[PDB]
Paper text:
The obtained experimental data revealed that triazoles induced the aggregation of Thermoanaerobacter brockii alcohol dehydrogenase (TbSADH) to form a gel complex; however, its stability was very low. Intermolecular interactions in this gel were strengthened by the synergistic chelation of metal ions. The active center catalyzing the asymmetric reduction of aryl prochiral ketones is mainly composed of Zn2+ ions and three amino acid residues (H59, C37, and D150). The activity of TbSADH is associated with the rate of hydride transfer from NADPH to the substrate.
Numbering used by the authors:
A (entry chain D), B (entry chain C), C (entry chain B), D (entry chain A): 0 to 268, 277 to 351
Write the structure that this text describes.
């Protein structure tokens, strides 16, 4: 019996008592050391993104310490400091063998935390297939930087990877939230040249400039498409990454990308003509990549100072009782907030 | 001064007389030996697909004999039997260096015939960059089979190529017109296993069965999506090729393709969720591939009996005066018609 | 306690008694219905390819029926007719997540049969990770055709896949043994145009002509390189697949492939210059692909009549006692032998 | 009639006077503003790398100003400051349509400077297909940095591109010459994690540390293979780039790369086993990339401060007469020399 911050119903949250999870032969029990609320939790609680839930613990971004393992777990033991990916696929299924985007398949059943399984906002949580999902966290990486790996960094970096960025190419990132900031960082990591970031919030604009954006487009000089086309002298961009917005941002991305380019869509929750190139494009989407290898490679990127995700963390809280406060801060989204982190 | 079948205005066609085209240093003049009307010509004439045109010769699918060449033309001489691609890109521009889909770039200005330039339905027509566009036609290939190469075969085969077909994968082809039939043939050429063809016309169904379709889905038996999902026992298809229909066929293709799959759109003229794989897809579109290398490789495929496009030709006409009759047949689309060919 | 045909010390084979294998929670026990000796077994026994072995049952190409399964096996039950791949990777390790060639990784520890584990030439054998390795065999596929799938078909088809074959490209297959014949079939399945097969044995030449080879090069007519260059008028081939021979055939393959082409090496057991394209090549090698998905896709290819591997089977034997006779036939390769099959 | 620094014969070098080149309709005449000798010139002169030459002007790395153009040249006019790529392919032949490595084909005939055509070490030189080869140089890029683009930067960056580097992967660079330093920079630009540089010269080691190398392996501390395997704890590297050395470095690269990895060979001038992964590798080689688009993308990388190639320049000379001194310095290869540059 442990504590957990759970969704009572659509629009209701509170602290409840639940039975302490037990690990199977291939599972592990992890207690969190640092957690971070996400906009997905808010969409679930208040927008009914995944339907109706009752007494479901929220949260899917945690860095924790292993406290219990199954009998068949070999690579991790209690006391090990680990990074828990947000997506934890089932690896004992032939579906994982299918594979796409140069990674493993079956990445639809991996979205378990806070969807069909208790989240990380508790004293303990359950990780399936621990040897296939968990990754060791070196002691030289701070907790606030490490907690950005499980969801934000992996989603943004996969958005950059799917954009088919060539060396020196011009890349546009629509939406400069945390996922968009990580998309800018990933575009820089892919050898992009000019990077155009679309956004208006001063703190997000400063973060985008820090992470490698060379041009900032504000939705006050005029339409986004006109500004971007004027920036590139009518040539457009080689690739665009969609990280936030509404359906109009998809039309804008189609408008601004050159024929043969790629539009990557990682934002969670027309006709072919001879004289118009708007339909001569590739649109790739997916919240695919999770697992131990992905986490290990991101950890290697952080460890060797290729990227510093600490700039995403604008608010730091101490103690278990501040999870609700961080969630509320995520709800009302003040102007100076990018991503809050609770250190346990 | 020569004759040609031209679009008088939106909805008006007739035989007009025009000045004989002259070739530049890198150009060639070709007289046609076999031509084929397309649905694109009908869309331009009667649906205003490309705007208003005046006395513009129609047609973009011809097999012809070189009549005269420019001073800088080296690989072709008058008397050579050649295949003229529908797309003839400008090759003396840096745009062709920015390629995609493992071919050259600049494949938007290549759509010249019957769009911004006189078509092939005349006694002569003009081909730009002859050494980079024309391809030699061996005498062992019949004219009716060869005339299917310039547009239908290349479009269908590129649709199959962009679908990312793996060996033994299940492929669905939506629309079994000539482009869809060539898409079925290309899917077979890419090592597909089960091929599901969606269509109802008996002649097109017979052609699809001939070209490698193992299952036929008729829309007179219920929704396409439900039938296809029943055929695959709820697994869906690995890839889908869109060759005809309306915007609802795009939704059907998105519904039937498994997560991580590819939807290829060669038919000329959702939100990311944890529990729904509809948005976890790749959509590739383009009427890209033209030029001499593409024509030569298709000619090699025909020559070595890898594919026989003669089944597409259901009506054969002799004489220049039958071009109007073939165009009218294309307009009224009778029961037994797939593709008419006029032999000069 | 069951019977098995085993290698005794070296150059010595015989029938021995061994303890009947028992399955783990994720394993299954399979009895064979059809088996096929391989040249790899002969290299192991007589050439010391893998070192010294004692009482090790040989054979790695079997089609069998499930006899019993572990408690955690869900997709297969006793009585099911299955195809057993030659490569059976360990799937409960993070190594398979790495991945290459658009398939799963860790395909080095999968070579277990007759290498570090008892082979299939016994009354029973052990298959690890049954739900991830075994594949259902439909009743409409004959045993002789099905037993070509586990090693020959997968190796040849992966050789064709790694060759980066484009539609209509010219492909050369060096060595027309069973793996080379399957490479010819795979090249045809990938949309190749001209296919040049290099070999001299009349039965293998006939099989190569059946599987899609358009040109046959005999080494009794001069050097292979000179003949191939004469066939292509000095242009060379777009890709080459090496299926048999020594380092000299690798040198020939480097010589005959055009700059930028790919040489695929699936045969088990230069300096960069401005004016010479010999080193401007890509050489891909690997006995990679194994597992349930690979077997299922190959089974789909056979089921839908995309390929008929029955032409490989030249000798058919009945009864358990004929395994030694088939192995001896494999040893002293006669004129009319391609692949012997023993039906149980 | 102009002066030029030419190779008199094998081992003989001096200043000669030659007729001033004249441009064709698609050509341009360029006078150099900064030039850099290369090891390729020394191999040509003192080692007979390309055979015997008589009065052939050397040099293939220049940044210059357009002096005059042909009648068909449109994108460049006299007075324009341009970057001249070392490889200048013929763009009016169908061969460029073939294409590989996601760029254009026909790149073997692009190696013209100081091979089959007068080099850049003269008062003027000839550039074929100016609109397809030349690239505008912004005034904000210094000459010393810009002159590293034509050969060193493009070769190293293509070596990094062909290595198939994934985010966070470990990359080894064998050879820490200027091409190897640019390979380290390109590996960093591709999102590599740990980068291991193999070299011993202190100036080259310092440059490698500057460009992103995290580990340095000195051959005075034991075998390279053993040191690298100890660094990675026996796992090896995900990819290796060969930029200098002898045939033993290829064996070392094969030994250190993990199965399924890629070895890229850009340094100008095993059998498949079940238990050994040495042959389960991909070897890619080529001095491929040249042309206007490549130069423009590299210029964009330099302009937006993604890479600073000024660290390569250790010796700067002023005046035309110092070309011989720079060439001699390249011959003697002193301790503190990486790349000399002559500013005109
Ligand atoms: Mg993905
Ligand atoms: Mg992973
Ligand atoms: Mg295309
Ligand atoms: Mg072409
Ligand atoms: Mg493989
Ligand atoms: Mg598999
Ligand atoms: Mg290349
Ligand atoms: Mg270029
Ligand atoms: Zn999240
Ligand atoms: Zn058409
Ligand atoms: Zn075998
Ligand atoms: Zn050089």
């Amino acid at each position: 019996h442990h504590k957990g911050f759970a969704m009572l119903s659509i629009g209701k949250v509170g602290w409840i008592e639940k039975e302490k999870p037990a690990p199977g032969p291939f599972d592990a029990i992890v207690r969190p050391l640092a957690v971070a609320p996400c906009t997905s939790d808010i969409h679930t609680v208040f927008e009914g993104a995944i339907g109706e839930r009752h007494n479901m613990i929220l949260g899917h971004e945690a860095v924790g310490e292993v406290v219990e393992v199954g009998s068949e777990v070999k690579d991790f033991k209690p006391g090990d400091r680990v990074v828990v990916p947000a997506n934890t696929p089932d690896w004992r299924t032939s579906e994982v063998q299918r594979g796409y985007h140069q990674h493993s398949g079956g990445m639809l059943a991996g979205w378990k935390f806070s969807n069909v399984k208790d989240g990380v906002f508790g004293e303990f949580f359950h990780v399936n297939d621990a040897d296939m999902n968990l990754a060791h966290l070196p002691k030289e990486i701070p907790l606030e930087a490490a907690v950005m790996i499980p969801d934000m960094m992996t989603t943004g970096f996969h958005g950059a990877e799917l954009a088919d960025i060539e060396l020196g190419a011009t890349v546009a990132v629509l939406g400069i939230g945390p996922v968009g900031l990580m998309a800018v960082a990933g575009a820089k990591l892919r050898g992009a040249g000019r990077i155009i970031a679309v956004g208006s919030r001063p703190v997000c604009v400063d973060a985008a400039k820090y992470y490698g954006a060379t041009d900032i487009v504000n939705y006050k000089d005029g339409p986004i498409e006109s500004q971007i086309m004027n920036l590139t002298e009518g040539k457009g961009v080689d690739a665009a990454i969609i990280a936030g917005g509404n359906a109009d941002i998809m039309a804008t991305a189609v408008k601004i990308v050159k024929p043969g380019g790629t539009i990557a869509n990682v934002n969670y929750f027309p006709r072919l003509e001879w004289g118009c190139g708007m339909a001569h494009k590739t649109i790739k989407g997916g919240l695919c990549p999770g697992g131990r290898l992905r986490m290990e490679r991101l950890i290697d990127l952080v460890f060797y100072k290729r990227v510093d995700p600490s700039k995403l963390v604008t608010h730091v809280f101490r103690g278990f009782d501040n999870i609700e406060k961080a969630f509320m801060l995520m709800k009302d989204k003040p102007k100076d907030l990018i991503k809050p982190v609770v250190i346990l």
